[PDB]
Amino acid sequence: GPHMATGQDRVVALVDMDCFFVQVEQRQNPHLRNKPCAVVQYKSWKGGGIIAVSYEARAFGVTRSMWADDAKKLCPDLLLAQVRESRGKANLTKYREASVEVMEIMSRFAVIERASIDEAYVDLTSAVQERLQKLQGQPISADLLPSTYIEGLPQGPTVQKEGMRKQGLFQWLDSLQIDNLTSPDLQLTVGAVIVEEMRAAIERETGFQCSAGISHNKVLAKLACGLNKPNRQTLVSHGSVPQLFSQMPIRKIRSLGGKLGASVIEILGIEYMGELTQFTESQLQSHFGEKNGSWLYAMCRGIEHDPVKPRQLPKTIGCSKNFPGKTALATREQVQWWLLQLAQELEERLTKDRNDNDRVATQLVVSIRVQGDKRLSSLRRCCALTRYDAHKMSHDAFTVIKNCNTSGIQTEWSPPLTMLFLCATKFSAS
DNA sequence: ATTATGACGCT
DNA sequence: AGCGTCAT
Ligand SMILES: Nc1nc2c(ncn2[C@H]2C[C@H](O)[C@@H](COP(=O)(O)NP(=O)(O)OP(=O)(O)O)O2)c(=O)[nH]1
Numbered sequence: 001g002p003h004m005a006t007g008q009d010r011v012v013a014l015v016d017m018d019c020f021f022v023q024v025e026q027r028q029n030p031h032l033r034n035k036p037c038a039v040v041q042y043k044s045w046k047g048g049g050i051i052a053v054s055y056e057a058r059a060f061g062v063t064r065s066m067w068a069d070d071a072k073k074l075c076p077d078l079l080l081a082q083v084r085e086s087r088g089k090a091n092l093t094k095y096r097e098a099s100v101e102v103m104e105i106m107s108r109f110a111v112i113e114r115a116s117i118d119e120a121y122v123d124l125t126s127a128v129q130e131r132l133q134k135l136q137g138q139p140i141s142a143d144l145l146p147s148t149y150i151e152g153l154p155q156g157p158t159v160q161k162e163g164m165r166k167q168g169l170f171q172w173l174d175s176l177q178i179d180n181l182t183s184p185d186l187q188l189t190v191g192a193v194i195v196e197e198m199r200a201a202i203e204r205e206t207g208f209q210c211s212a213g214i215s216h217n218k219v220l221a222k223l224a225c226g227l228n229k230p231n232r233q234t235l236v237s238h239g240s241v242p243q244l245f246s247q248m249p250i251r252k253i254r255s256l257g258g259k260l261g262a263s264v265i266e267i268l269g270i271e272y273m274g275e276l277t278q279f280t281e282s283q284l285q286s287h288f289g290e291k292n293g294s295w296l297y298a299m300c301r302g303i304e305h306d307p308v309k310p311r312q313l314p315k316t317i318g319c320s321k322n323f324p325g326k327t328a329l330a331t332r333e334q335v336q337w338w339l340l341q342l343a344q345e346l347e348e349r350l351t352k353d354r355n356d357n358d359r360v361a362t363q364l365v366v367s368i369r370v371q372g373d374k375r376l377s378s379l380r381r382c383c384a385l386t387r388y389d390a391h392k393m394s395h396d397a398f399t400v401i402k403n404c405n406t407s408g409i410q411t412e413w414s415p416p417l418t419m420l421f422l423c424a425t426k427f428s429a430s
Numbered sequence: 431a432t433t434a435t436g437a438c439g440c441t
Numbered sequence: 442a443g444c445g446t447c448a449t
């Protein structure tokens with residue numbers, strides 16, 4: 001009872017940009033704004049592959065991973081923006097630079113954990129304590145939460161979406177105990193006020209809209225963020241978890257959408273996250289390992305301890321290109337030319353990284369996939385990265401992979417290569 | 431012939 | 442170190 005820690009110590013937010021690459025292109029090209037729009041890479045094969053979709057286009061069924069030609073069958077007026085091509089490959093520099101814009105704004109409010117090109121976690125615990133001090137016990141006005149949903153409300157004792165949002169927010173605020181500076185629900189509410197301010201700053205200073213989740217840990221904050229996109233934020237309280245998880249398919253939790261989540265479902269004969277509560281910690285550890293078992297035992301109760309890491313920058317910088325079907329690399333000249341193309345992009349990104357961030361990569365990882373292998377990587381080899389020079393890096397990558405070529409002929413490459421991947425790792429302060 | 435990444439756990 | 446998983 002009283003000693004049963006409830007994982008309510010922290011206030012954690014997850015901010016995720018809405019249809020991010022689409023918004024970057026819509027900012028640049030006003031003709032694309034407020035339209036069914038998608039971003040594609042390449043064009044020749046089936047119109048290119050869609051990687052981002054505006055909410056207007058999603059209403060027609062357009063999704064990521066869809067070929068543009070098929071998307072056009074669902075949405076004939078779909079507008080398309082193509083990712084830049086440089087050195088024969090997709091070049092995502094524009095979106096990385098836009099990401100840096102957003103991360104630098106978020107960092108004004110708290111130390112952030114960059115989790116992807118378009119999202120970051122925020123530990124707002126200390127900022128919340130400060131704002132609570134400033135409030136001096138003053139209640140929180142609904143006017144300070146103009147885009148916030150409270151998950152699970154309204155309940156009990158109404159036709160429009162905004163009206164439902166305001167009803168739930170009123171029920172939440174009316175039940176708040178604001179004389180207690182240690183009430184977790186109050187702390188979450190102040191966190192949501194701060195996140196409204198952060199999201200307002202992002203939109204004012206970049207033009208980009210985003211959604212967010214506010215809860216007591218990273219997994220619940222990420223889930224919350226998804227609940228009401230686009231352009232809204234959602235508060236998931238500790239008390240909302242039993243109802244939320246009672247119908248939540250296990251795969252919707254981050255980390256359980258693959259083989260492990262399938263094994264939870266099959267071994268235990270359950271469907272929903274809430275059903276996990278009936279098992280002991282030891283039972284879950286016996287099926288899924290000590291670490292996964294403890295994580296599942298806590299997570300189905302709304303509890304997770306993974307910290308928001310103080311990391312605004314990516315840990316690795318990588319360049320990769322697939323060579324599908326008849327485009328697979330089958331000569332030594334081809335392999336060297338594309339290694340050089342990847343290495344040149346890598347050199348340019350690394351040199352800019354060193355200038356901006358006062359650090360140097362020290363290890364080069366070379367990954368390839370060979371024809372007939374379904375795995376992502378057929379082989380990974382590391383070597384030393386001592387100079388930011390594309391010719392040296394491509395020569396070294398060739399040296400570490402060249403023993404892959406089973407062809408006796410010096411010129412041919414067999415079996416052909418369907419992917420090259422260069423990734424710079426192990427950064428040191430320079 | 432989804433693609434280009436990036437994080438992280440395991441042994 | 443190299444591989445596998447999850448993600449998207
Ligand atoms: N190259 C590449 N980029 C991708 C891929 N998948 C996503 N991206 C890029 C394009 C995406 O814009 C961006 C962010 O990914 P999300 O947050 O998962 N999706 P979004 O922000 O579009 O919509 P929502 O409002 O639902 O969050 O990452 C991929 O497979 N390949």
Ligand SMILES: [Mn+2]
Pocket residue numbers: 016017018019020118
């Ligand atoms: Mn997003």
Ligand SMILES: [Mn+2]
Pocket residue numbers: 016017116118119
């Ligand atoms: Mn995202």
